[PDB]
Design a protein around this ligand. Sequence first.
Ligand SMILES: CN1CCN(C(=O)c2ccc(NC(=O)c3csc4c(=O)[nH]cnc34)c(-c3ccccc3)c2)CC1
Length: 296
Amino acid sequence: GPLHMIDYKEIEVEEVVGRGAFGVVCKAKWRAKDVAIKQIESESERKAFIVELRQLSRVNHPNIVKLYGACLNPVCLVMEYAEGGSLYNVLHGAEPLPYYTAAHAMSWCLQCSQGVAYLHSMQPKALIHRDLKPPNLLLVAGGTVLKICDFGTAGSAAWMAPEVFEGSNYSEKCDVFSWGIILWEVITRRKPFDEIGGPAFRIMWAVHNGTRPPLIKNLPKPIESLMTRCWSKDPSQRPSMEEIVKIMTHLMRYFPGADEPLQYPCQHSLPPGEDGRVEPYVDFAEFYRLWSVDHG
Ligand SMILES: CN1CCN(C(=O)c2ccc(NC(=O)c3csc4c(=O)[nH]cnc34)c(-c3ccccc3)c2)CC1
């Protein structure tokens, strides 16, 4: 649809806000509007650039970053600016970190699944993101609205389905695995496979052998089932994104307050796992109370 060929002179480039999965992202102004501009640095990043330009111009969804246009002198994309930064920074960035609730955690994952389900429903071919992870998930509207970005492939071993790095043939089900890891990550406020570390191949080996993130103490059984289904070794046993959207949509009845902006401070550090399980960062006592009222 609407896509502007942009004269660079019209872009007032403010500060560098970070590096995307490729390129460099700057806060900028264009037509008196706040935008993000993504510029390639290397000549190698040109492939990711054409891919992203093609893919992002195809897509129109509330949970996918808006592409306003492109400049070719110099080669850069002009996109929606995400004032809340990345989910990864919200979760794991420098202190002070924001407080967030079970409702936020569930809402972010629902919104991610809605974006990805839209991708998987594209005609004539499904669009696969292939690099779903909190660095590539952005927040707007006081941290309450999530948008997928970094479509240059449409650092990442901790979210990658084992069939992807096994060089095996794969499908949209790879995004489902990634989503399952993200669900664990927002609930625990832990970096997946942080304890392994090393170089990437050590994570790949672990996941390849069936290592998954530790189970979560007092996690509601339906959330646990959904999570562990998503990270099945066999991609055909993983649910479709359409099913995840439906399940997560119905679960939100038991997670009111997702519309509350991130505004409260938090002082957060990690206790190690008591058994083989970890504590959730979020609290499920309210979920269980609301469930009990509804069911009996
Ligand atoms: C003081 N103020 C400074 C700016 N700010 C951020 O932290 C802050 C604000 C905005 C950001 N990005 C975007 O708006 C953005 C739009 S499209 C796109 C993409 O395709 N890839 C990565 N980022 C973006 C980032 C950021 C996040 C991850 C990687 C690179 C950039 C950080 C909030 C706090």
